[PDB]
Amino acid sequence: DIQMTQSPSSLSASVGDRVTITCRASQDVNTAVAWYQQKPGKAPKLLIYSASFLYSGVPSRFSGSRSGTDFTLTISSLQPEDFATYYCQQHYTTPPTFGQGTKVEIKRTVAAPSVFIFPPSDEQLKSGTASVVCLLNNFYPREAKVQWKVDNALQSGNSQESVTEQDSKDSTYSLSSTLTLSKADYEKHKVYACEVTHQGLSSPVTKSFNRGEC
Amino acid sequence: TQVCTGTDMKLRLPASPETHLDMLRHLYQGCQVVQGNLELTYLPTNASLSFLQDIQEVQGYVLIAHNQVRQVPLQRLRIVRGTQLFEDNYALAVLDNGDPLSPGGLRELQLRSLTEILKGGVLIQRNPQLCYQDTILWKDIFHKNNQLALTLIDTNRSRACHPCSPMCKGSRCWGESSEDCQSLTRTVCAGGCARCKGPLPTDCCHEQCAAGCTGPKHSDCLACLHFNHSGICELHCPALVTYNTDTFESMPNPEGRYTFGASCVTACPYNYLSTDVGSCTLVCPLHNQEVTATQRCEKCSKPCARVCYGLGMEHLREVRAVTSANIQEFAGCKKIFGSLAFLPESFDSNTAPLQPEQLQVFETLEEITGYLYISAWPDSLPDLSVFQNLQVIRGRILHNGAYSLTLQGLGISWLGLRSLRELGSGLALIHHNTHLCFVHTVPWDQLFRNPHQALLHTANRPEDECVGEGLACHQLCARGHCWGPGPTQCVNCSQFLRGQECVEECRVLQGLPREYVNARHCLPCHPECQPQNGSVTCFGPEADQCVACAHYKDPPFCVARCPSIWKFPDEEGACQPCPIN
Amino acid sequence: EVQLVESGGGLVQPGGSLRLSCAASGFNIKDTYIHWVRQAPGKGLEWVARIYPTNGYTRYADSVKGRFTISADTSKNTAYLQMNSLRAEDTAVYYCSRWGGDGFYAMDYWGQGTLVTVSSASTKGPSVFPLAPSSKSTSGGTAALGCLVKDYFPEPVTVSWNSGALTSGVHTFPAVLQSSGLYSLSSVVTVPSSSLGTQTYICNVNHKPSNTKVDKKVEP
Ligand SMILES: *[C@@H]1O[C@H](CO)[C@@H](O)[C@H](O)[C@H]1NC(C)=O
Ligand SMILES: *[C@@H]1O[C@H](CO)[C@@H](O)[C@H](O)[C@H]1NC(C)=O
């Protein structure tokens, strides 16, 4: 049952780069190998077939080669839209098999986030719960620390982060931090703060509103 | 197995008495409740009817006719319900029980327990040796809502009768013996009482009892008015469903039960259809179709999907036989609801004869819900192979009410019903087929589904004669069981099947077009697998299931040619794409 | 364009059955092999089954054989995966794909996917709350606003803005699972603050499993 070992499992390259993705077949597979590109929440799309043939309307920047049982996808000048998981597949025998995929991440220039604070809406409030939401828009790199300062005190266990996939045009991430309180725990306190530190801001940025002051 | 079905032969002569007695015995031995009609006709002087002893209940009518037996032991018959009636009027008919044109003829009705008739009257005519019949207070036996019941009793005889035993309370008895007195159960009760065991209020039966009782409560009845729910007489069975008290959604009742005859049952008997309404029947109720889950009746979602009818149903209800006027009515039909009968008049009535080739319509037939009756059949045809794909005759309708397969007087040389695996119910009657071998070759045991079933058989080709001509089952047939001669007629193939020929080996290792085996079927390897030497040639049917390509490979497939999409042979034989467009 | 549309996704009880459907549009399924390929959350692509509709010949991955049944209906131009006896291992996005072409055994077309989620929990539709733009969500000439889509099971949710007219500067966040067992996401967008109260802004949230469709105006 032919196995396809794909490496590396993930890589970082920058725009302009020449990226290489390998995949070894456990046994002879001739030329019966295909390459797919999957983008966040999309179907995979075919890039290369029969090892080395550019599929219709794929940018010529994509190339495939074979060297025995090792098969190589080459992106020759990495572009932002090339952010994706890539998969070799063999169809030499049935069943056809997929490699594990290799995630291509794009290394760009540092990007300070825009920070925004959102109080609970009045509608949620009257249902017993409150989500305070804190957004960091369009930053690179991905790693940031988000702490909340409820009337000036730290928080733990009551906060969750969510971070988008790298943007296909400008390669940044956006992050959302949600502080979840009961109506009653929330009404207790006046000042609501969201503090972010990120490798792109000179001084850590606090974003913060007053409860009920509109 | 207190329960059997009766017959529906009325006054028709059995095609063979020998078998008539055997059927009667098989049908009734051990039986206590007859669903349908208890018909005892054309029974000889010498007949042992002890198999009848246990009958307590008759759902339809009782008919004792054209018999030479001096007695029929129905001493235990308690109630006849009259669900169906003889000549539309009669629950009990006793007719022409005397010799052909010592001596023969029924002498005494002997119905000492017969204590309830729910519907219909009594017809006793032309019984020359019969005494006592005019002594019975029918008034008593007939139900309260059955007094208007017709009673037509003839006392012309041929022997002088003595009066009833002095021991019998009024003039009233079933026979001569002090043991034969009519016990009265209706005219003899306290206040407004339907039934009793004696003159007192305490002797009064529960209102749910039907024939008398042995005590005051619904557990003491001699029979049920309506339904027997686990030994307790009840107006109705528990509903299959309870309703949500607020919403009115159906909730399964764990106590729920289906009504089968006058009984409450947890599950319909094997060959009956379950109803949405909690009943067990043999034809679905209005705008209701059958499905297989076992066989249920449900409500048709879209309007009831049209179906193919056999004899006994719809426009063919009163139609005798399959004829040149109706045979094409079966073109394309997988399943016939009702029956099929071929009688002389089917072939050689001014009506154009069925030519043997018309018969081919039946090639698609897989199920008959009714019966199959063949009493004439084209000389030129050696078997029933037009029914080769008939898988199941269910017998929810029975020829004469008794037989679901009948073959008599035919000319056929074997059966060839090589797909038939079930006789849902009913008996099989194969008689008087001069040339027919391969009857005691079929494992009838396997087609039957209840112990009341059997194969009744006489005057077919004598078995030693079949073997004397060398007409056995083929070698390749498991357990010597087959429907006719040769490797296509096996019941179960003992080795492998290629098409419909039972064969010794599939061409897995040897032989012109190689093959693989799926569940004992030989199927062809794809023509592009290289036949192998000393190893298997493929793992299944597709061109990517070869061990090796006969020619080239466009992976994962072996192919005759490289496609010319323009591709060319590798050096290893695998198609690469042409680099030029 | 050739097109393959999956349907039938949604919550299944463990042990339960489900029938996925793949309607092909723009080619005849009789002319090729149809596969189902599945992707557990955050894991690779796994080939499940293939069928060849001309003759109904099937092949299956070992991880499904005996449970899942592939089939075709040539008249409807539709392929099926009858998925029996499901378990949590089987929670995945199921795509349908073809080997478009007779000497082309690479998968050139794929459907969008349907999420099957195998779980004993039950459906809960979301509440949708506005993330109101204001001074504390404005930097430069720009306002951020959005929708919180709270308390839903199972995945997926779909948010759009102004019925699809507004896509630039949109970020719909990957759902977070809450210790309630329920999911929660937020969709957000950046707009010229000049536009506020001139242009109306509506998130369109859709939670197919719940038959929840919310259009929510977000405004200062
Ligand atoms: C009874 O009547 C029949 C027919 O009406 C007559 O032929 C017959 O001989 C009579 N039987 C007796 C009592 O002899
Ligand atoms: C009801 O049926 C049971 C067996 O199922 C039996 O004990 C009983 O005799 C029947 N009752 C009557 C009144 O026939």
mmCIF file with all atom_site columns, N, CA, C and O in Angstrom, chain B residues 516 541-542 544-545 554-557 559 563 565 567, chain C residues 33 50 52 55 57-59 99 101-105:
data_model
loop_
_atom_site.group_PDB
_atom_site.id
_atom_site.type_symbol
_atom_site.label_atom_id
_atom_site.label_alt_id
_atom_site.label_comp_id
_atom_site.label_asym_id
_atom_site.label_entity_id
_atom_site.label_seq_id
_atom_site.pdbx_PDB_ins_code
_atom_site.Cartn_x
_atom_site.Cartn_y
_atom_site.Cartn_z
_atom_site.occupancy
_atom_site.B_iso_or_equiv
_atom_site.pdbx_formal_charge
_atom_site.auth_seq_id
_atom_site.auth_comp_id
_atom_site.auth_asym_id
_atom_site.auth_atom_id
_atom_site.pdbx_PDB_model_num
ATOM 1   N N  . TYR B 1 516 ? -11.435 -14.309 -11.311 1.00 0.00 ? 516 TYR B N  1
ATOM 2   C CA . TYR B 1 516 ? -11.291 -14.334 -9.888  1.00 0.00 ? 516 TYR B CA 1
ATOM 3   C C  . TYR B 1 516 ? -12.610 -14.816 -9.310  1.00 0.00 ? 516 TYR B C  1
ATOM 4   O O  . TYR B 1 516 ? -13.561 -14.964 -10.013 1.00 0.00 ? 516 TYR B O  1
ATOM 5   N N  . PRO B 1 541 ? -12.471 -7.197  -10.633 1.00 0.00 ? 541 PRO B N  1
ATOM 6   C CA . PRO B 1 541 ? -12.843 -6.994  -12.044 1.00 0.00 ? 541 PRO B CA 1
ATOM 7   C C  . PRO B 1 541 ? -12.095 -5.886  -12.808 1.00 0.00 ? 541 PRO B C  1
ATOM 8   O O  . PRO B 1 541 ? -11.931 -5.994  -14.029 1.00 0.00 ? 541 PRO B O  1
ATOM 9   N N  . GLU B 1 542 ? -11.693 -4.816  -12.131 1.00 0.00 ? 542 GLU B N  1
ATOM 10  C CA . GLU B 1 542 ? -11.067 -3.642  -12.785 1.00 0.00 ? 542 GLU B CA 1
ATOM 11  C C  . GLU B 1 542 ? -9.608  -3.802  -13.260 1.00 0.00 ? 542 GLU B C  1
ATOM 12  O O  . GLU B 1 542 ? -8.850  -4.617  -12.731 1.00 0.00 ? 542 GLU B O  1
ATOM 13  N N  . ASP B 1 544 ? -7.092  -2.049  -12.756 1.00 0.00 ? 544 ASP B N  1
ATOM 14  C CA . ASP B 1 544 ? -6.082  -1.705  -11.762 1.00 0.00 ? 544 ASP B CA 1
ATOM 15  C C  . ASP B 1 544 ? -6.039  -2.776  -10.680 1.00 0.00 ? 544 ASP B C  1
ATOM 16  O O  . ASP B 1 544 ? -5.522  -2.556  -9.574  1.00 0.00 ? 544 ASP B O  1
ATOM 17  N N  . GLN B 1 545 ? -6.599  -3.941  -10.996 1.00 0.00 ? 545 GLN B N  1
ATOM 18  C CA . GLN B 1 545 ? -6.623  -5.038  -10.045 1.00 0.00 ? 545 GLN B CA 1
ATOM 19  C C  . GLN B 1 545 ? -5.860  -6.225  -10.590 1.00 0.00 ? 545 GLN B C  1
ATOM 20  O O  . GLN B 1 545 ? -6.027  -7.325  -10.090 1.00 0.00 ? 545 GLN B O  1
ATOM 21  N N  . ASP B 1 554 ? -1.428  2.642   -17.922 1.00 0.00 ? 554 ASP B N  1
ATOM 22  C CA . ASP B 1 554 ? -1.633  4.038   -17.610 1.00 0.00 ? 554 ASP B CA 1
ATOM 23  C C  . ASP B 1 554 ? -2.103  4.125   -16.150 1.00 0.00 ? 554 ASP B C  1
ATOM 24  O O  . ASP B 1 554 ? -3.290  4.052   -15.860 1.00 0.00 ? 554 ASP B O  1
ATOM 25  N N  . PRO B 1 555 ? -1.161  4.288   -15.232 1.00 0.00 ? 555 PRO B N  1
ATOM 26  C CA . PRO B 1 555 ? -1.412  4.010   -13.815 1.00 0.00 ? 555 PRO B CA 1
ATOM 27  C C  . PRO B 1 555 ? -2.613  4.800   -13.251 1.00 0.00 ? 555 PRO B C  1
ATOM 28  O O  . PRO B 1 555 ? -2.689  6.021   -13.457 1.00 0.00 ? 555 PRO B O  1
ATOM 29  N N  . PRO B 1 556 ? -3.477  4.154   -12.467 1.00 0.00 ? 556 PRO B N  1
ATOM 30  C CA . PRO B 1 556 ? -3.254  2.793   -11.943 1.00 0.00 ? 556 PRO B CA 1
ATOM 31  C C  . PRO B 1 556 ? -3.676  1.625   -12.843 1.00 0.00 ? 556 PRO B C  1
ATOM 32  O O  . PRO B 1 556 ? -3.594  0.459   -12.370 1.00 0.00 ? 556 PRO B O  1
ATOM 33  N N  . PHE B 1 557 ? -4.114  1.927   -14.081 1.00 0.00 ? 557 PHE B N  1
ATOM 34  C CA . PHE B 1 557 ? -4.691  0.937   -15.008 1.00 0.00 ? 557 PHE B CA 1
ATOM 35  C C  . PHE B 1 557 ? -3.808  0.326   -16.079 1.00 0.00 ? 557 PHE B C  1
ATOM 36  O O  . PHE B 1 557 ? -3.068  1.036   -16.784 1.00 0.00 ? 557 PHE B O  1
ATOM 37  N N  . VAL B 1 559 ? -3.701  -0.992  -19.710 1.00 0.00 ? 559 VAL B N  1
ATOM 38  C CA . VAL B 1 559 ? -4.485  -0.644  -20.877 1.00 0.00 ? 559 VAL B CA 1
ATOM 39  C C  . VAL B 1 559 ? -3.879  -1.267  -22.125 1.00 0.00 ? 559 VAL B C  1
ATOM 40  O O  . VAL B 1 559 ? -2.649  -1.476  -22.192 1.00 0.00 ? 559 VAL B O  1
ATOM 41  N N  . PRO B 1 563 ? -3.151  6.264   -24.622 1.00 0.00 ? 563 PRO B N  1
ATOM 42  C CA . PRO B 1 563 ? -4.164  7.179   -25.179 1.00 0.00 ? 563 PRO B CA 1
ATOM 43  C C  . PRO B 1 563 ? -3.600  8.166   -26.185 1.00 0.00 ? 563 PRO B C  1
ATOM 44  O O  . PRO B 1 563 ? -2.585  8.809   -25.900 1.00 0.00 ? 563 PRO B O  1
ATOM 45  N N  . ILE B 1 565 ? -5.291  15.084  -24.047 1.00 0.00 ? 565 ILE B N  1
ATOM 46  C CA . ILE B 1 565 ? -4.751  13.775  -23.656 1.00 0.00 ? 565 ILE B CA 1
ATOM 47  C C  . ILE B 1 565 ? -4.044  13.020  -24.799 1.00 0.00 ? 565 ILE B C  1
ATOM 48  O O  . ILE B 1 565 ? -4.676  12.308  -25.580 1.00 0.00 ? 565 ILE B O  1
ATOM 49  N N  . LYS B 1 567 ? -0.641  10.470  -24.940 1.00 0.00 ? 567 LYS B N  1
ATOM 50  C CA . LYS B 1 567 ? 0.387   9.816   -24.140 1.00 0.00 ? 567 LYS B CA 1
ATOM 51  C C  . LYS B 1 567 ? 1.207   8.808   -24.931 1.00 0.00 ? 567 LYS B C  1
ATOM 52  O O  . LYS B 1 567 ? 0.764   8.342   -25.981 1.00 0.00 ? 567 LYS B O  1
ATOM 53  N N  . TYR C 2 33  ? -14.271 8.361   -12.703 1.00 0.00 ? 33  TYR C N  1
ATOM 54  C CA . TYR C 2 33  ? -14.306 7.875   -11.348 1.00 0.00 ? 33  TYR C CA 1
ATOM 55  C C  . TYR C 2 33  ? -14.612 9.045   -10.450 1.00 0.00 ? 33  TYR C C  1
ATOM 56  O O  . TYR C 2 33  ? -14.165 10.198  -10.704 1.00 0.00 ? 33  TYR C O  1
ATOM 57  N N  . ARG C 2 50  ? -13.985 5.126   -3.971  1.00 0.00 ? 50  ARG C N  1
ATOM 58  C CA . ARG C 2 50  ? -14.219 5.586   -5.315  1.00 0.00 ? 50  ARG C CA 1
ATOM 59  C C  . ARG C 2 50  ? -15.304 4.741   -5.946  1.00 0.00 ? 50  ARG C C  1
ATOM 60  O O  . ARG C 2 50  ? -15.515 3.601   -5.538  1.00 0.00 ? 50  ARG C O  1
ATOM 61  N N  . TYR C 2 52  ? -17.132 3.887   -9.986  1.00 0.00 ? 52  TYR C N  1
ATOM 62  C CA . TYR C 2 52  ? -17.097 4.094   -11.390 1.00 0.00 ? 52  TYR C CA 1
ATOM 63  C C  . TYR C 2 52  ? -18.528 3.877   -11.858 1.00 0.00 ? 52  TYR C C  1
ATOM 64  O O  . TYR C 2 52  ? -18.971 2.752   -11.937 1.00 0.00 ? 52  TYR C O  1
ATOM 65  N N  . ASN C 2 55  ? -20.364 1.078   -14.396 1.00 0.00 ? 55  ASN C N  1
ATOM 66  C CA . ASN C 2 55  ? -20.632 -0.265  -13.893 1.00 0.00 ? 55  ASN C CA 1
ATOM 67  C C  . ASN C 2 55  ? -20.806 -0.397  -12.379 1.00 0.00 ? 55  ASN C C  1
ATOM 68  O O  . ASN C 2 55  ? -20.912 -1.498  -11.854 1.00 0.00 ? 55  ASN C O  1
ATOM 69  N N  . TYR C 2 57  ? -18.738 -0.362  -10.147 1.00 0.00 ? 57  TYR C N  1
ATOM 70  C CA . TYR C 2 57  ? -17.549 -0.899  -9.480  1.00 0.00 ? 57  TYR C CA 1
ATOM 71  C C  . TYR C 2 57  ? -16.996 0.078   -8.428  1.00 0.00 ? 57  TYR C C  1
ATOM 72  O O  . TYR C 2 57  ? -16.728 1.247   -8.744  1.00 0.00 ? 57  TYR C O  1
ATOM 73  N N  . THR C 2 58  ? -16.808 -0.411  -7.193  1.00 0.00 ? 58  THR C N  1
ATOM 74  C CA . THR C 2 58  ? -16.332 0.434   -6.098  1.00 0.00 ? 58  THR C CA 1
ATOM 75  C C  . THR C 2 58  ? -14.998 -0.009  -5.550  1.00 0.00 ? 58  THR C C  1
ATOM 76  O O  . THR C 2 58  ? -14.591 -1.153  -5.745  1.00 0.00 ? 58  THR C O  1
ATOM 77  N N  . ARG C 2 59  ? -14.295 0.911   -4.903  1.00 0.00 ? 59  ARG C N  1
ATOM 78  C CA . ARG C 2 59  ? -13.123 0.582   -4.085  1.00 0.00 ? 59  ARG C CA 1
ATOM 79  C C  . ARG C 2 59  ? -13.203 1.407   -2.826  1.00 0.00 ? 59  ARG C C  1
ATOM 80  O O  . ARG C 2 59  ? -13.844 2.481   -2.837  1.00 0.00 ? 59  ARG C O  1
ATOM 81  N N  . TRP C 2 99  ? -11.679 12.189  -11.283 1.00 0.00 ? 99  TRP C N  1
ATOM 82  C CA . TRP C 2 99  ? -10.469 12.028  -12.050 1.00 0.00 ? 99  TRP C CA 1
ATOM 83  C C  . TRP C 2 99  ? -10.742 12.539  -13.427 1.00 0.00 ? 99  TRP C C  1
ATOM 84  O O  . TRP C 2 99  ? -10.437 11.883  -14.418 1.00 0.00 ? 99  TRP C O  1
ATOM 85  N N  . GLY C 2 101 ? -11.519 12.894  -16.864 1.00 0.00 ? 101 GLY C N  1
ATOM 86  C CA . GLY C 2 101 ? -10.802 12.498  -18.062 1.00 0.00 ? 101 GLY C CA 1
ATOM 87  C C  . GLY C 2 101 ? -10.362 11.043  -18.042 1.00 0.00 ? 101 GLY C C  1
ATOM 88  O O  . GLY C 2 101 ? -10.081 10.484  -16.978 1.00 0.00 ? 101 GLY C O  1
ATOM 89  N N  . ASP C 2 102 ? -10.247 10.471  -19.239 1.00 0.00 ? 102 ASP C N  1
ATOM 90  C CA . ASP C 2 102 ? -9.945  9.053   -19.380 1.00 0.00 ? 102 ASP C CA 1
ATOM 91  C C  . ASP C 2 102 ? -8.481  8.605   -19.413 1.00 0.00 ? 102 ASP C C  1
ATOM 92  O O  . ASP C 2 102 ? -8.223  7.393   -19.409 1.00 0.00 ? 102 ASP C O  1
ATOM 93  N N  . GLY C 2 103 ? -7.532  9.523   -19.459 1.00 0.00 ? 103 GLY C N  1
ATOM 94  C CA . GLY C 2 103 ? -6.151  9.137   -19.244 1.00 0.00 ? 103 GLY C CA 1
ATOM 95  C C  . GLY C 2 103 ? -5.532  10.190  -18.358 1.00 0.00 ? 103 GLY C C  1
ATOM 96  O O  . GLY C 2 103 ? -4.418  10.686  -18.574 1.00 0.00 ? 103 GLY C O  1
ATOM 97  N N  . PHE C 2 104 ? -6.316  10.580  -17.369 1.00 0.00 ? 104 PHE C N  1
ATOM 98  C CA . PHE C 2 104 ? -5.949  11.654  -16.501 1.00 0.00 ? 104 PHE C CA 1
ATOM 99  C C  . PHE C 2 104 ? -6.410  11.229  -15.120 1.00 0.00 ? 104 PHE C C  1
ATOM 100 O O  . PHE C 2 104 ? -7.562  11.401  -14.771 1.00 0.00 ? 104 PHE C O  1
ATOM 101 N N  . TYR C 2 105 ? -5.521  10.618  -14.358 1.00 0.00 ? 105 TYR C N  1
ATOM 102 C CA . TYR C 2 105 ? -5.952  10.026  -13.108 1.00 0.00 ? 105 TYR C CA 1
ATOM 103 C C  . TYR C 2 105 ? -5.481  10.811  -11.911 1.00 0.00 ? 105 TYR C C  1
ATOM 104 O O  . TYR C 2 105 ? -5.210  10.247  -10.852 1.00 0.00 ? 105 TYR C O  1
#
